[PDB]
């Protein structure tokens, strides 16, 4: 996809992560497990809700066919009426179909962007206290317990706190 994360460097999705669109998997001495990122999920949810409403609302001023009859000596008029009602029908079918195709594209790319941005946020916080594996994972140069994992997930990781332990581990 456009942003290279979904079906990209993050090669697959998680059946294990049930309560959000994007989030985390952690692994330490205490054990392992999944957790959704609530902030990013909610931001995306709001956007998508706005998107659907917009596509619908823009096609509320749409043509309606109104039943009329014509004599056998009004065939041109009848044809004009038919061409018109068919013509607007075709315009609005086009508008609906195109809009849905274009917005579906952007919807998939939006989620891709959201995943990439979350990844980059974590990356930029952890810095060289971790190894970037290339698969969506960061492997720590220090021990990172549940409290530590939680700080990363809510964007309060203490780089300086683990800096010395990490530099020592990283430099051997």
């Amino acid at each position: 996809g456009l942003f290279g994360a979904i079906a990209g460097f993050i090669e697959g999705g998680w059946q294990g992560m049930v309560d959000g669109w994007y989030g985390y998997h952690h692994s330490n001495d205490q054990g392992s497990g999944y957790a959704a990122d609530k902030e990013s999920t909610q931001k995306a949810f709001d956007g998508i809700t706005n998107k659907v409403n917009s596509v619908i609302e823009k096609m509320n001023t749409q043509f309606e066919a109104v039943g009329k009859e014509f004599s056998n000596l009004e065939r041109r008029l009848e044809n004009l009426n038919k061409k018109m009602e068919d013509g607007f029908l075709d315009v609005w079918t086009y508008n609906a179909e195109l809009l849905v195709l274009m917005e579906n594209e952007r919807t998939l790319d939006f989620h891709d962007s959201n995943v990439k941005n979350l990844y980059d946020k974590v990356r930029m916080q952890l810095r060289d206290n971790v190894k970037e594996l290339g698969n969506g994972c960061f492997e720590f140069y220090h021990k990172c317990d549940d409290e530590c994992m939680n700080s990363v997930k809510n964007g309060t990781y203490d780089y300086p706190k683990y800096e010395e332990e990490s530099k020592l581990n990283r430099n051997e």
């Binding site: 669109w21 692994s27 195709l101 594209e105």
Partner: protein, 322 residues
């Protein structure tokens, strides 16, 4: 190898598909179908108000009062009108109806009439009014359109026929009249005694007149004669005057427009069922909250927007990845 945190995205069991410009048949975790494709296959009341079911009658058969349409002699307010493609019971005495499609169009914004006896038949004391035809027979005897009066000779005379009506009814009033075009002159003399007759009609705005045409034509409903009907909407407080020395088919009634609003004539061969809807199509009624439908272009009521699409599915979730 050390402790890890990984970033990732939701996947599930969804097999919902969507299309994009770049790719087709993409599986997504969540999607929203915005197109209603179903209907109940029935003709229904629209917000509890039933349609006017003409059955085998046409609009003309109803308003003129073809005797096969007697169930329609007094009808309550309707929400739409059901008419068959080729109703059997129309002009029982054959002929034509001027500006008929215009009259049908008027009916799209009328929801009720009050039929008013504007020119009571018994007031034509100088003419015979029991005139009728086997083509409009009732119980094996000649009869005629119930709402109309065929004036003929009385005691071998047809004096000048005059009637007028001031529309004091409180709304505009639809009034129909006709002229008889005979097959031959024996017919003309037996019926009207007079020759070189005329039918004249005048309001503040209409001055429409006629000389009957005598002429051989193929038989329709057994008859070579024809009756040519015309109509006008008589404004409030305006007067209509009829004047004739022969061949006038007078209205006895006028139809006061008693309720106005969005309506319509639906072409259908079907019959009203005991059901309720907010949105009626000729194929059946729609009950949906979806914004689009593809059922039929010709709908009545509070309806979704019609498109020709076979599918409209918006992706809401992300690509569903194994």
């Amino acid at each position: 190898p050390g402790d890890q945190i990984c970033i990732g995205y939701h996947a599930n069991n969804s097999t919902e598909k969507v299309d994009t410009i770049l790719e087709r048949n993409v599986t997504v975790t969540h999607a929203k179908d915005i197109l209603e494709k179903t209907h109940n296959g029935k003709l229904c009341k629209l917000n509890g108000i039933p349609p006017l079911e003409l059955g085998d009658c046409s609009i003309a058969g109803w308003l003129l009062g073809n005797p096969e349409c007697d169930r329609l002699l007094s009808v309550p307010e309707w929400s739409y009108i059901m008419e068959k493609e080729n109703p059997r019971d129309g002009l029982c005495y054959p002929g034509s109806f001027n500006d008929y499609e215009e009259l049908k169009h008027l009916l799209s914004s009328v929801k009720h009439f009050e039929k008013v006896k504007i020119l009571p038949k018994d007031r034509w004391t100088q003419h015979t009014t029991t005139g009728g035809s086997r083509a409009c027979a009732v119980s094996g005897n000649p009869s005629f359109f119930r709402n109309m009066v065929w004036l003929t000779e009385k005691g071998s005379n047809y004096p000048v026929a005059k009637g007028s009506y001031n529309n004091t009814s409180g709304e505009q009033m639809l009034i129909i009249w006709g002229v008889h075009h005979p097959n031959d002159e024996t017919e003309q003399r037996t019926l009207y005694q007079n020759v070189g007759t005329y039918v004249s009609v005048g309001t503040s705005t209409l001055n429409k007149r006629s000389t009957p045409e005598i002429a051989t034509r193929p038989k329709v409903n057994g008859l070579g004669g024809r009756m040519e009907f015309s109509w006008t909407l008589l404004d409030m407080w305006d007067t209509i005057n009829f004047e004739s020395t022969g061949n006038l088919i007078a209205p006895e009634y006028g139809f006061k427009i008693s309720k106005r609003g969005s309506s319509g004539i639906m072409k259908t061969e079907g019959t009203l069922e005991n059901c309720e809807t907010k949105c009626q199509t000729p194929l059946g009624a729609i009950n949906t909250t979806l914004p689009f439908h593809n059922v039929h272009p010709l709908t009545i009521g509070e309806c979704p927007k019609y498109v020709k699409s076979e599918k409209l599915v918006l992706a809401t979730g992300l690509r569903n990845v194994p």
